[PDB]
PDB file of all heavy atoms in Angstrom:
ATOM      1  N   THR O  95     179.136 124.149 100.435  1.00  0.00           N
ATOM      2  CA  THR O  95     180.282 123.965 101.361  1.00  0.00           C
ATOM      3  C   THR O  95     179.819 122.976 102.438  1.00  0.00           C
ATOM      4  O   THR O  95     178.613 122.997 102.795  1.00  0.00           O
ATOM      5  CB  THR O  95     180.842 125.276 101.905  1.00  0.00           C
ATOM      6  OG1 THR O  95     179.934 125.863 102.841  1.00  0.00           O
ATOM      7  CG2 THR O  95     181.207 126.239 100.788  1.00  0.00           C
ATOM      8  N   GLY O  96     180.707 122.095 102.893  1.00  0.00           N
ATOM      9  CA  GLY O  96     180.356 120.968 103.774  1.00  0.00           C
ATOM     10  C   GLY O  96     179.147 120.230 103.251  1.00  0.00           C
ATOM     11  O   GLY O  96     178.207 120.002 104.030  1.00  0.00           O
ATOM     12  N   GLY O  97     179.124 119.914 101.966  1.00  0.00           N
ATOM     13  CA  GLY O  97     178.029 119.200 101.315  1.00  0.00           C
ATOM     14  C   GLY O  97     178.068 117.682 101.525  1.00  0.00           C
ATOM     15  O   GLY O  97     177.161 116.999 101.018  1.00  0.00           O
ATOM     16  N   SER O  98     179.056 117.149 102.242  1.00  0.00           N
ATOM     17  CA  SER O  98     179.328 115.683 102.302  1.00  0.00           C
ATOM     18  C   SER O  98     178.450 114.963 103.337  1.00  0.00           C
ATOM     19  O   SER O  98     178.272 113.726 103.207  1.00  0.00           O
ATOM     20  CB  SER O  98     180.766 115.417 102.609  1.00  0.00           C
ATOM     21  OG  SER O  98     181.224 116.126 103.748  1.00  0.00           O
ATOM     22  N   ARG O  99     178.027 115.654 104.396  1.00  0.00           N
ATOM     23  CA  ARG O  99     177.213 115.012 105.467  1.00  0.00           C
ATOM     24  C   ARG O  99     176.239 116.022 106.056  1.00  0.00           C
ATOM     25  O   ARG O  99     176.378 117.226 105.782  1.00  0.00           O
ATOM     26  CB  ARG O  99     178.108 114.367 106.533  1.00  0.00           C
ATOM     27  CG  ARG O  99     178.555 115.264 107.666  1.00  0.00           C
ATOM     28  CD  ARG O  99     179.043 114.517 108.920  1.00  0.00           C
ATOM     29  NE  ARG O  99     180.066 115.327 109.585  1.00  0.00           N
ATOM     30  CZ  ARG O  99     181.288 115.532 109.102  1.00  0.00           C
ATOM     31  NH1 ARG O  99     181.676 114.947 107.980  1.00  0.00           N
ATOM     32  NH2 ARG O  99     182.109 116.338 109.731  1.00  0.00           N
ATOM     33  N   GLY O 100     175.283 115.502 106.820  1.00  0.00           N
ATOM     34  CA  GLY O 100     174.391 116.321 107.631  1.00  0.00           C
ATOM     35  C   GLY O 100     173.532 117.180 106.739  1.00  0.00           C
ATOM     36  O   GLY O 100     173.012 116.686 105.701  1.00  0.00           O
ATOM     37  N   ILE O 101     173.347 118.428 107.134  1.00  0.00           N
ATOM     38  CA  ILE O 101     172.446 119.343 106.362  1.00  0.00           C
ATOM     39  C   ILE O 101     173.008 119.527 104.935  1.00  0.00           C
ATOM     40  O   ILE O 101     172.208 119.509 103.986  1.00  0.00           O
ATOM     41  CB  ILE O 101     172.260 120.655 107.127  1.00  0.00           C
ATOM     42  CG1 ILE O 101     171.444 120.428 108.419  1.00  0.00           C
ATOM     43  CG2 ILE O 101     171.606 121.692 106.230  1.00  0.00           C
ATOM     44  CD1 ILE O 101     171.559 121.551 109.435  1.00  0.00           C
ATOM     45  N   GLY O 102     174.336 119.669 104.808  1.00  0.00           N
ATOM     46  CA  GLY O 102     175.026 119.870 103.512  1.00  0.00           C
ATOM     47  C   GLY O 102     174.720 118.732 102.556  1.00  0.00           C
ATOM     48  O   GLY O 102     174.318 118.975 101.388  1.00  0.00           O
ATOM     49  N   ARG O 103     174.777 117.499 103.061  1.00  0.00           N
ATOM     50  CA  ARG O 103     174.447 116.317 102.230  1.00  0.00           C
ATOM     51  C   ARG O 103     172.988 116.388 101.767  1.00  0.00           C
ATOM     52  O   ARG O 103     172.720 116.102 100.578  1.00  0.00           O
ATOM     53  CB  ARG O 103     174.817 115.053 103.006  1.00  0.00           C
ATOM     54  CG  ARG O 103     174.112 113.796 102.541  1.00  0.00           C
ATOM     55  CD  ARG O 103     174.759 112.628 103.265  1.00  0.00           C
ATOM     56  NE  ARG O 103     174.142 111.406 102.804  1.00  0.00           N
ATOM     57  CZ  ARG O 103     173.579 110.498 103.583  1.00  0.00           C
ATOM     58  NH1 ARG O 103     173.564 110.651 104.896  1.00  0.00           N
ATOM     59  NH2 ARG O 103     173.027 109.433 103.044  1.00  0.00           N
ATOM     60  N   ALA O 104     172.033 116.716 102.650  1.00  0.00           N
ATOM     61  CA  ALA O 104     170.599 116.806 102.279  1.00  0.00           C
ATOM     62  C   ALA O 104     170.435 117.891 101.198  1.00  0.00           C
ATOM     63  O   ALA O 104     169.626 117.717 100.236  1.00  0.00           O
ATOM     64  CB  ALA O 104     169.741 117.093 103.530  1.00  0.00           C
ATOM     65  N   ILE O 105     171.094 119.041 101.385  1.00  0.00           N
ATOM     66  CA  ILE O 105     171.028 120.165 100.397  1.00  0.00           C
ATOM     67  C   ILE O 105     171.580 119.641  99.059  1.00  0.00           C
ATOM     68  O   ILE O 105     170.876 119.765  98.019  1.00  0.00           O
ATOM     69  CB  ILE O 105     171.766 121.415 100.906  1.00  0.00           C
ATOM     70  CG1 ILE O 105     171.042 122.063 102.098  1.00  0.00           C
ATOM     71  CG2 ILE O 105     171.963 122.416  99.771  1.00  0.00           C
ATOM     72  CD1 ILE O 105     171.936 122.980 102.930  1.00  0.00           C
ATOM     73  N   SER O 106     172.786 119.069  99.101  1.00  0.00           N
ATOM     74  CA  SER O 106     173.487 118.563  97.890  1.00  0.00           C
ATOM     75  C   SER O 106     172.526 117.646  97.147  1.00  0.00           C
ATOM     76  O   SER O 106     172.289 117.869  95.958  1.00  0.00           O
ATOM     77  CB  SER O 106     174.757 117.878  98.236  1.00  0.00           C
ATOM     78  OG  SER O 106     175.699 118.794  98.737  1.00  0.00           O
ATOM     79  N   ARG O 107     171.917 116.687  97.859  1.00  0.00           N
ATOM     80  CA  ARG O 107     171.067 115.628  97.235  1.00  0.00           C
ATOM     81  C   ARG O 107     169.781 116.228  96.671  1.00  0.00           C
ATOM     82  O   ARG O 107     169.367 115.851  95.576  1.00  0.00           O
ATOM     83  CB  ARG O 107     170.769 114.519  98.250  1.00  0.00           C
ATOM     84  CG  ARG O 107     172.005 113.749  98.692  1.00  0.00           C
ATOM     85  CD  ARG O 107     171.653 112.707  99.740  1.00  0.00           C
ATOM     86  NE  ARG O 107     170.691 111.747  99.220  1.00  0.00           N
ATOM     87  CZ  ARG O 107     169.924 110.941  99.948  1.00  0.00           C
ATOM     88  NH1 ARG O 107     170.007 110.944 101.266  1.00  0.00           N
ATOM     89  NH2 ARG O 107     169.087 110.114  99.349  1.00  0.00           N
ATOM     90  N   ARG O 108     169.133 117.122  97.407  1.00  0.00           N
ATOM     91  CA  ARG O 108     167.923 117.824  96.933  1.00  0.00           C
ATOM     92  C   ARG O 108     168.264 118.647  95.669  1.00  0.00           C
ATOM     93  O   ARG O 108     167.511 118.567  94.678  1.00  0.00           O
ATOM     94  CB  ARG O 108     167.384 118.693  98.078  1.00  0.00           C
ATOM     95  CG  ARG O 108     166.179 119.533  97.703  1.00  0.00           C
ATOM     96  CD  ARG O 108     164.974 118.716  97.292  1.00  0.00           C
ATOM     97  NE  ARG O 108     163.745 119.423  97.650  1.00  0.00           N
ATOM     98  CZ  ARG O 108     162.620 119.418  96.943  1.00  0.00           C
ATOM     99  NH1 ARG O 108     162.544 118.754  95.803  1.00  0.00           N
ATOM    100  NH2 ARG O 108     161.569 120.087  97.372  1.00  0.00           N
ATOM    101  N   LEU O 109     169.315 119.468  95.691  1.00  0.00           N
ATOM    102  CA  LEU O 109     169.625 120.318  94.501  1.00  0.00           C
ATOM    103  C   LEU O 109     169.873 119.427  93.262  1.00  0.00           C
ATOM    104  O   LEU O 109     169.325 119.746  92.193  1.00  0.00           O
ATOM    105  CB  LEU O 109     170.810 121.227  94.811  1.00  0.00           C
ATOM    106  CG  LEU O 109     170.553 122.289  95.880  1.00  0.00           C
ATOM    107  CD1 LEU O 109     171.779 123.151  96.093  1.00  0.00           C
ATOM    108  CD2 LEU O 109     169.342 123.129  95.530  1.00  0.00           C
ATOM    109  N   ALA O 110     170.620 118.326  93.419  1.00  0.00           N
ATOM    110  CA  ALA O 110     170.968 117.367  92.337  1.00  0.00           C
ATOM    111  C   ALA O 110     169.718 116.665  91.808  1.00  0.00           C
ATOM    112  O   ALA O 110     169.575 116.537  90.567  1.00  0.00           O
ATOM    113  CB  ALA O 110     171.978 116.382  92.853  1.00  0.00           C
ATOM    114  N   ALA O 111     168.805 116.278  92.705  1.00  0.00           N
ATOM    115  CA  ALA O 111     167.540 115.587  92.366  1.00  0.00           C
ATOM    116  C   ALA O 111     166.672 116.520  91.516  1.00  0.00           C
ATOM    117  O   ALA O 111     165.854 116.037  90.702  1.00  0.00           O
ATOM    118  CB  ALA O 111     166.849 115.155  93.637  1.00  0.00           C
ATOM    119  N   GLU O 112     166.865 117.827  91.686  1.00  0.00           N
ATOM    120  CA  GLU O 112     166.124 118.881  90.963  1.00  0.00           C
ATOM    121  C   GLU O 112     166.917 119.359  89.737  1.00  0.00           C
ATOM    122  O   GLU O 112     166.481 120.345  89.120  1.00  0.00           O
ATOM    123  CB  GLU O 112     165.851 120.032  91.928  1.00  0.00           C
ATOM    124  CG  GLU O 112     165.176 119.585  93.209  1.00  0.00           C
ATOM    125  CD  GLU O 112     163.794 120.147  93.466  1.00  0.00           C
ATOM    126  OE1 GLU O 112     162.928 120.044  92.565  1.00  0.00           O
ATOM    127  OE2 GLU O 112     163.588 120.676  94.580  1.00  0.00           O
ATOM    128  N   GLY O 113     168.028 118.702  89.393  1.00  0.00           N
ATOM    129  CA  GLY O 113     168.673 118.877  88.079  1.00  0.00           C
ATOM    130  C   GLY O 113     169.929 119.706  88.162  1.00  0.00           C
ATOM    131  O   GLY O 113     170.547 119.905  87.114  1.00  0.00           O
ATOM    132  N   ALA O 114     170.328 120.149  89.356  1.00  0.00           N
ATOM    133  CA  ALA O 114     171.573 120.927  89.531  1.00  0.00           C
ATOM    134  C   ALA O 114     172.779 120.000  89.387  1.00  0.00           C
ATOM    135  O   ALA O 114     172.687 118.841  89.832  1.00  0.00           O
ATOM    136  CB  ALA O 114     171.607 121.635  90.860  1.00  0.00           C
ATOM    137  N   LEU O 115     173.864 120.528  88.814  1.00  0.00           N
ATOM    138  CA  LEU O 115     175.228 119.962  88.893  1.00  0.00           C
ATOM    139  C   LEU O 115     175.824 120.446  90.205  1.00  0.00           C
ATOM    140  O   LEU O 115     175.973 121.665  90.345  1.00  0.00           O
ATOM    141  CB  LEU O 115     176.071 120.444  87.710  1.00  0.00           C
ATOM    142  CG  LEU O 115     177.562 120.143  87.817  1.00  0.00           C
ATOM    143  CD1 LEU O 115     177.806 118.641  87.894  1.00  0.00           C
ATOM    144  CD2 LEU O 115     178.319 120.742  86.638  1.00  0.00           C
ATOM    145  N   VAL O 116     176.128 119.555  91.149  1.00  0.00           N
ATOM    146  CA  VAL O 116     176.481 119.970  92.532  1.00  0.00           C
ATOM    147  C   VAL O 116     177.940 119.682  92.822  1.00  0.00           C
ATOM    148  O   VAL O 116     178.342 118.496  92.794  1.00  0.00           O
ATOM    149  CB  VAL O 116     175.585 119.307  93.590  1.00  0.00           C
ATOM    150  CG1 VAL O 116     176.019 119.746  94.987  1.00  0.00           C
ATOM    151  CG2 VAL O 116     174.126 119.585  93.314  1.00  0.00           C
ATOM    152  N   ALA O 117     178.672 120.728  93.172  1.00  0.00           N
ATOM    153  CA  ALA O 117     180.004 120.659  93.797  1.00  0.00           C
ATOM    154  C   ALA O 117     179.820 120.378  95.294  1.00  0.00           C
ATOM    155  O   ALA O 117     179.380 121.302  96.041  1.00  0.00           O
ATOM    156  CB  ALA O 117     180.789 121.919  93.559  1.00  0.00           C
ATOM    157  N   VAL O 118     180.194 119.165  95.712  1.00  0.00           N
ATOM    158  CA  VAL O 118     180.096 118.679  97.111  1.00  0.00           C
ATOM    159  C   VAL O 118     181.425 118.965  97.760  1.00  0.00           C
ATOM    160  O   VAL O 118     182.343 118.169  97.588  1.00  0.00           O
ATOM    161  CB  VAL O 118     179.754 117.185  97.185  1.00  0.00           C
ATOM    162  CG1 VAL O 118     179.743 116.699  98.635  1.00  0.00           C
ATOM    163  CG2 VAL O 118     178.443 116.888  96.495  1.00  0.00           C
ATOM    164  N   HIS O 119     181.500 120.040  98.529  1.00  0.00           N
ATOM    165  CA  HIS O 119     182.762 120.497  99.126  1.00  0.00           C
ATOM    166  C   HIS O 119     182.866 119.911 100.537  1.00  0.00           C
ATOM    167  O   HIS O 119     181.804 119.681 101.200  1.00  0.00           O
ATOM    168  CB  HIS O 119     182.863 122.013  99.093  1.00  0.00           C
ATOM    169  CG  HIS O 119     183.767 122.498 100.155  1.00  0.00           C
ATOM    170  ND1 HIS O 119     183.330 122.695 101.458  1.00  0.00           N
ATOM    171  CD2 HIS O 119     185.100 122.681 100.160  1.00  0.00           C
ATOM    172  CE1 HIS O 119     184.367 123.040 102.204  1.00  0.00           C
ATOM    173  NE2 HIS O 119     185.468 123.052 101.413  1.00  0.00           N
ATOM    174  N   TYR O 120     184.091 119.722 100.999  1.00  0.00           N
ATOM    175  CA  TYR O 120     184.400 119.129 102.321  1.00  0.00           C
ATOM    176  C   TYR O 120     185.872 119.434 102.647  1.00  0.00           C
ATOM    177  O   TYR O 120     186.637 119.804 101.736  1.00  0.00           O
ATOM    178  CB  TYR O 120     184.024 117.639 102.279  1.00  0.00           C
ATOM    179  CG  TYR O 120     185.059 116.875 101.502  1.00  0.00           C
ATOM    180  CD1 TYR O 120     186.115 116.275 102.171  1.00  0.00           C
ATOM    181  CD2 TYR O 120     185.070 116.894 100.116  1.00  0.00           C
ATOM    182  CE1 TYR O 120     187.137 115.658 101.477  1.00  0.00           C
ATOM    183  CE2 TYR O 120     186.092 116.293  99.403  1.00  0.00           C
ATOM    184  CZ  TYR O 120     187.126 115.676 100.093  1.00  0.00           C
ATOM    185  OH  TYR O 120     188.148 115.067  99.445  1.00  0.00           O
ATOM    186  N   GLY O 121     186.269 119.322 103.918  1.00  0.00           N
ATOM    187  CA  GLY O 121     187.630 119.661 104.367  1.00  0.00           C
ATOM    188  C   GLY O 121     188.498 118.459 104.759  1.00  0.00           C
ATOM    189  O   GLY O 121     189.747 118.655 104.812  1.00  0.00           O
ATOM    190  N   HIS O 122     187.905 117.311 105.108  1.00  0.00           N
ATOM    191  CA  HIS O 122     188.591 116.232 105.883  1.00  0.00           C
ATOM    192  C   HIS O 122     188.210 114.845 105.375  1.00  0.00           C
ATOM    193  O   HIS O 122     189.116 114.127 104.937  1.00  0.00           O
ATOM    194  CB  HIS O 122     188.341 116.364 107.386  1.00  0.00           C
ATOM    195  CG  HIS O 122     188.710 117.688 107.959  1.00  0.00           C
ATOM    196  ND1 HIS O 122     187.821 118.765 107.994  1.00  0.00           N
ATOM    197  CD2 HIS O 122     189.859 118.132 108.515  1.00  0.00           C
ATOM    198  CE1 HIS O 122     188.409 119.787 108.575  1.00  0.00           C
ATOM    199  NE2 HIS O 122     189.668 119.430 108.894  1.00  0.00           N
TER     200      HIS O 122
END
Protein backbone atom coordinates (compact mmCIF):
# COMPACT_ATOMS: atom_id res chain seq x y z
CA THR A 1 0.00 0.00 0.00
CA GLY A 2 1.40 3.45 -0.96
CA GLY A 3 4.10 1.58 -2.91
CA SER A 4 4.53 4.47 -5.47
CA ARG A 5 6.93 6.79 -3.52
CA GLY A 6 9.03 7.12 -0.38
CA ILE A 7 9.38 4.05 1.85
CA GLY A 8 6.64 2.20 -0.19
CA ARG A 9 8.63 2.67 -3.42
CA ALA A 10 11.87 1.35 -1.75
CA ILE A 11 9.90 -1.69 -0.38
CA SER A 12 8.23 -2.27 -3.81
CA ARG A 13 11.64 -2.12 -5.62
CA ARG A 14 13.48 -4.34 -3.08
CA LEU A 15 10.71 -7.05 -3.10
CA ALA A 16 10.65 -7.03 -6.99
CA ALA A 17 14.50 -7.16 -7.20
CA GLU A 18 14.24 -10.32 -5.01
CA GLY A 19 11.77 -11.95 -7.46
CA ALA A 20 8.37 -10.88 -6.05
CA LEU A 21 5.47 -9.88 -8.34
CA VAL A 22 4.58 -6.50 -6.72
CA ALA A 23 1.20 -4.75 -6.65
CA VAL A 24 2.19 -1.04 -6.34
CA HIS A 25 -0.86 0.54 -4.71
CA TYR A 26 -1.52 4.32 -4.50
CA GLY A 27 -4.52 6.70 -4.02
CA HIS A 28 -3.79 9.88 -6.10
